[PDB]
Design a protein around this nucleic acid. Structure first.
Ligand SMILES: [Mg+2]
Ligand SMILES: [Mg+2]
Ligand SMILES: [Mg+2]
Ligand SMILES: [Mg+2]
Ligand SMILES: [Mg+2]
Ligand SMILES: [Mg+2]
Ligand SMILES: [Mg+2]
Ligand SMILES: [Mg+2]
Ligand SMILES: [Mg+2]
Ligand SMILES: [Mg+2]
Ligand SMILES: [Mg+2]
Ligand SMILES: [Mg+2]
Ligand SMILES: [Mg+2]
Ligand SMILES: [Mg+2]
Ligand SMILES: [Mg+2]
Ligand SMILES: [Mg+2]
Ligand SMILES: [Mg+2]
Ligand SMILES: [Mg+2]
Ligand SMILES: [Mg+2]
Ligand SMILES: [Mg+2]
Ligand SMILES: [Mg+2]
Ligand SMILES: [Mg+2]
Ligand SMILES: [Mg+2]
Ligand SMILES: [Mg+2]
Ligand SMILES: [Mg+2]
Ligand SMILES: [Mg+2]
Ligand SMILES: [Mg+2]
Ligand SMILES: [Mg+2]
Ligand SMILES: [Mg+2]
Ligand SMILES: [Mg+2]
Ligand SMILES: [Mg+2]
Ligand SMILES: [Mg+2]
Ligand SMILES: [Mg+2]
Ligand SMILES: [Mg+2]
Ligand SMILES: [Mg+2]
Ligand SMILES: [Mg+2]
Ligand SMILES: [Mg+2]
Ligand SMILES: [Mg+2]
Ligand SMILES: [Mg+2]
Ligand SMILES: [Mg+2]
Ligand SMILES: [Mg+2]
Ligand SMILES: [Mg+2]
Ligand SMILES: [Mg+2]
Ligand SMILES: [Mg+2]
Ligand code: NA
Lengths: 50, 75, 136, 116, 58, 94, 69
RNA sequence: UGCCUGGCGGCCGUAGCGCGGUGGUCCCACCUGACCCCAUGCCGAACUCAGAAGUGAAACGCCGUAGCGCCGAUGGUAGUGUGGGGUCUCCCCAUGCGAGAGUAGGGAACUGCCAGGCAU
RNA sequence: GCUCAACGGAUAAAAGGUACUCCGGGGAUAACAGGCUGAUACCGCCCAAGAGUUCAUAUCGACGGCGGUGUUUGGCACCU
RNA sequence: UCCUCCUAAAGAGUAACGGAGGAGCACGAAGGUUGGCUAAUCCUGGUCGGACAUCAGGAGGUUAGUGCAAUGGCAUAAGCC
RNA sequence: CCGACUUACCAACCCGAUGCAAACUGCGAAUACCGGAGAAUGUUAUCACGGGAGACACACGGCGGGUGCUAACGUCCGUCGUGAAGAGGGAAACAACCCAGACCGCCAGCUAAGGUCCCAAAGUCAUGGUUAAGUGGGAAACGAUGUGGGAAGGCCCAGAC
């Protein structure tokens, strides 16, 4: 539908990322979650990307 | 117009009363909780009742609502 | 011509007609017309029999119809192949088992009731009999 | 009813503890007279108990039904439990908030030695 | 100890699979074949299952 | 004052009761009080001619079973679905 | 069979026969009686008077001189 | 040991509801006060705390009452596995299983652990 | 990154006509005729409201019911 | 193509151009947890206000709700804050 | 404004009674299925893994159904049987129905279904009854002092029909 797949990139130096979806029409603010980074093995902030 | 149906889901009781199961064995596949988890029985996200221990399947109607529970007798 | 208002579904399976009836007693009147045989009563047959009764007895007396067709019968149009979906609902039948009281009558002598029930049974596809209300 | 509201408020944790097979320290609060029991995993028989309706406890409290009385009951029940050998219990609010007298009882039980 | 003689009096051709399995469990092969079996409730239940085609003498 | 002769049923159930009603009797039961229920057979012609009176269902009846006279009352009657026949009668004692 | 709120043909006053049609169709048109020949005797009908009268007075290609539609 | 009460269970309507009566030493409940612990998308209603003067009004418990709910035979009936039969999309016979409903009736729960009070 | 939705997706990429037709087959399957059936068709009977100046049944017969035949159109696809 | 019910003969499965309906998503909260709460619909009373708004009480009992079909669930709520 | 009248009409809820349901269920079988134990029986009949297939047009009959018209030697499922791929006997003849599974031979015997007057093997068998219709040896609603049996009932040697 109108939900676009976005990429949450780790704020650590790792190129690690999760992928999710987002309704950019209703929520135009970036996702700023705190997910587990398996490269550094810590919970760091993942920020939305493309 | 008609003509559509769904693939059958193969629900229902897999292991019946008195049957010896291993831990993790699926006992009943259901939509809601027709059967409720008793002792040593877990309920999955799709409400699948599974054995959390090795033992025998046991059905009861305990409770104030007379609902049916499945437990694993650790035998 | 009796017919249900706003049923759940338009069409139903053929089903069977095994078993004995349930409403086998004269519950509302003094006399009744009970089905000895098994079959289908269409709404047209029920209405014909009711008119025969209501004319044989004059405006006097009360008449109960104990049966409702409540079952749609479909037919395919003529010159249509087999298949292409179930046919269209043409009429409604009541399923009748042996013993079903079909009509009851009250407020008339038994002789008038008998001749009215005969006039009406002549309109029905089912073998009938005359019954009276029994104490217990 | 406040009683029925509280019992349905407690039912979930009670059934969870019964499922876990835990020995439970059940508290019961009343405007006067807080109560505590330690009940076996089978839930049908009491292992230990302590309350301000007991004279040996109430004799040392100027009011039974306050935080100090609750702390006294908590210390007493945890002492009796540790003497019977019951160390690892689970707390059962019985539908009361874990805020005042109930929290005082639970804290007193913790400092006395009951692990929960 | 107590035995019972069972003869097959009818054919097994168009019989139910369970009936043919019962005749096998009794040991009956032919029509007119007579076996001698132990007189236990299980044997009696087999004889009951296929009574329409076996004859019993005790 | 209705009197009905009856024998006790030796065999009971579906096939036995059907054999009875074919042999022109019909089963009946007597119950009530502390005495156990008593299964009896009635002559269908006799009882069908008797029950045609509306007082059969109000008066206290008597049933002669094994010589014993049991005062009863017609409690329930199972009639044939469409035939003018009786299938079963319940008699409450006294 | 209905003509008006007061005029309906009893459906037995209407003779309907089956015949073979003209034109294309092959063996099926040769052998099959798909064409309908409807005959309706106006005088022998239970049609209203003045309806019988107008039908018998009309000069229509579908009404024969014997008073048959 | 008895009675009463509180808590936690078993059991899940023979156990619930209604109707009537009844209990306040203790317990319980309402209750009193609230700036505080804490609380109200407003409110000390609730939740919470500090208490206990008053009342058992309500609630709750107990005791009666069947007006209901509920339980419920026996017998019969329905259905039905197997074999057989007929007049055969419905039945019957032999045998085995045998309801549901209803009827007679039952029925105002029973019980375990702990604690407290009173009487002993 | 695929209404690859004909959704196990044959290509990245594809509509028609043939009575000018052709081949391999099929009675696996239509058109004729036969068969089974009898919805339809046609014929008969039952009930009898009524019409018939009265009068159901001289004649006709509503609302309904039960059959027969195997002329129609069909259904099926058993033969070819 | 997928989902729900029935057909489907009380395990599973089960066909038809059989009978009925939906999906091709939504949601960073509509997820997690903790704490708390319990509906529909009526009646009575009440400014505008009304069949129907909000308030109070009673009855009622989940006849509601479950982001979207249907089914099975759901009060310990899976429903509501 | 207001309002007794005309509510003799319809009529919700509720109460009492009567039914109906594939897509209703406060009930609920028989069977079937799953599991465990125990005999007896069965040439392991079971499973696994390997070599080789063929087959994936099914038919009819019974039972449970959908569809069709409670049509079809119809169609579509479930399940069993048979045919397919099974000869023999019976049903006149008649894959699929009934009985019954052909290793070969015999101018031996007993039986199954079905039969026993003649064709044509075997009862012109025995006992009791029914039917006159050649019913048996096709059919419905409905009609009828056909005839047999049964249970009552009305009126009747103060005389019934
Ligand atoms: Mg399905
Ligand atoms: Mg102790
Ligand atoms: Mg056979
Ligand atoms: Mg039987
Ligand atoms: Mg052309
Ligand atoms: Mg032709
Ligand atoms: Mg004419
Ligand atoms: Mg006081
Ligand atoms: Mg009071
Ligand atoms: Mg019984
Ligand atoms: Mg019962
Ligand atoms: Mg896509
Ligand atoms: Mg494709
Ligand atoms: Mg495909
Ligand atoms: Mg492809
Ligand atoms: Mg060619
Ligand atoms: Mg063909
Ligand atoms: Mg061929
Ligand atoms: Mg043809
Ligand atoms: Mg006239
Ligand atoms: Mg033809
Ligand atoms: Mg075919
Ligand atoms: Mg030919
Ligand atoms: Mg199933
Ligand atoms: Mg099944
Ligand atoms: Mg949610
Ligand atoms: Mg919560
Ligand atoms: Mg008002
Ligand atoms: Mg059902
Ligand atoms: Mg193929
Ligand atoms: Mg195929
Ligand atoms: Mg069938
Ligand atoms: Mg075929
Ligand atoms: Mg076929
Ligand atoms: Mg072949
Ligand atoms: Mg053969
Ligand atoms: Mg042959
Ligand atoms: Mg023949
Ligand atoms: Mg021959
Ligand atoms: Mg052989
Ligand atoms: Mg013989
Ligand atoms: Mg001879
Ligand atoms: Mg002779
Ligand atoms: Mg003849
Ligand atoms: Na009764």
């Amino acid at each position: 539908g109108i939900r676009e797949k976005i990429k949450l990139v780790s704020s650590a130096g790792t190129g690690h990322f999760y992928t999710t979806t987002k309704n950019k029409r209703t929520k135009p603010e970036k996702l700023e979650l705190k997910k587990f980074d398996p490269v550094v093995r810590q919970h760091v902030i993942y920020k939305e990307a493309k | 117009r008609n003509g559509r149906d769904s693939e059958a889901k193969r629900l229902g009781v897999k292991r019946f009363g008195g049957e010896s199961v291993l831990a993790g064995s699926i006992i009943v596949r259901q939509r809601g909780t027709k059967f409720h988890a008793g002792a040593n029985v877990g309920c999955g996200r799709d409400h699948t009742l599974f054995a959390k221990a090795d033992g025998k399947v046991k059905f009861e109607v305990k409770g104030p609502k007379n609902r049916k529970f499945i437990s694993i007798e650790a035998e | 011509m009796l017919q249900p208002k706003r049923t759940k579904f338009r069409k139903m399976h053929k089903g069977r007609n095994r078993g004995l009836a349930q409403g086998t007693d004269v519950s509302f009147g003094s006399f009744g017309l009970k089905a000895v045989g098994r079959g289908r009563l269409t709404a047209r047959q029920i209405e014909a029999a009711r008119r025969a009764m209501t004319r044989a007895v004059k405006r006097q007396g009360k008449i109960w119809i104990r049966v409702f067709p409540d079952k749609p019968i479909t037919e395919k149009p003529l010159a249509v192949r087999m298949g292409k979906g179930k046919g269209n609902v043409e009429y409604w039948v009541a399923l009748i088992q042996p013993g079903k009281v079909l009509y009851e009558m009250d407020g008339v002598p038994e002789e008038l009731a008998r001749e009215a029930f005969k006039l009406a049974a002549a309109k029905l596809p089912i073998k009938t009999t005359f019954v009276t209300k029994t104490v217990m | 009813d406040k009683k029925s509201a509280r019992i349905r408020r407690a039912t979930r944790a009670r059934r969870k503890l019964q499922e876990l097979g835990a020995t439970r320290l059940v508290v019961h609060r009343t405007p006067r007279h807080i109560y505590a029991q330690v009940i076996a995993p089978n839930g049908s028989e009491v292992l230990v108990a302590a309350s301000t309706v007991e004279k040996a406890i109430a004799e040392q409290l100027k009011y039974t039904g306050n935080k100090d009385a609750a702390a006294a009951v908590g210390k007493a029940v945890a002492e009796r439990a540790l003497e019977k050998g019951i160390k690892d219990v689970s707390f059962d609010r019985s539908g009361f908030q874990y805020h005042g007298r109930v929290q005082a009882l639970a804290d007193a039980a913790r400092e006395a030695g009951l692990q929960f | 100890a107590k035995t019972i003689k069972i003869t097959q009096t009818r054919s097994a051709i168009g019989r139910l699979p369970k009936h043919k399995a019962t005749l096998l469990g009794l040991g009956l092969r032919r029509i007119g074949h007579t076996v001698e079996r132990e007189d236990t409730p299980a044997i009696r239940g087999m004889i009951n299952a296929v009574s329409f085609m076996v004859k019993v003498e005790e | 004052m209705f009197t009905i002769n009856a024998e006790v049923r030796k065999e009971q159930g579906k096939g036995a009761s059907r054999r009875l009603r074919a042999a022109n009797k019909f089963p009946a039961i007597i119950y009530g009080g502390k005495e156990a229920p008593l299964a009896i057979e009635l002559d269908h012609d006799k009882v069908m001619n008797m029950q045609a009176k509306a007082e059969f269902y109000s008066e206290v009846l008597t049933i002669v079973v094994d010589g014993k006279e049991i005062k009863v009352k017609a409690q329930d009657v199972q009639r044939h679905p469409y035939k003018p026949k009786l299938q079963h009668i319940d008699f409450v004692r006294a | 069979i209905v003509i008006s709120r007061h005029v309906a043909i009893p459906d037995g006053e209407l003779e309907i026969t089956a015949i073979r049609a003209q034109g294309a169709g092959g063996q099926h048109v040769n052998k099959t009686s798909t064409a309908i020949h409807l005959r309706f005797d106006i005088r022998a009908s239970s049609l209203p008077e003045y309806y019988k009268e107008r039908l018998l007075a009309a000069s229509h290609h579908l009404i024969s001189s014997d008073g048959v539609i």
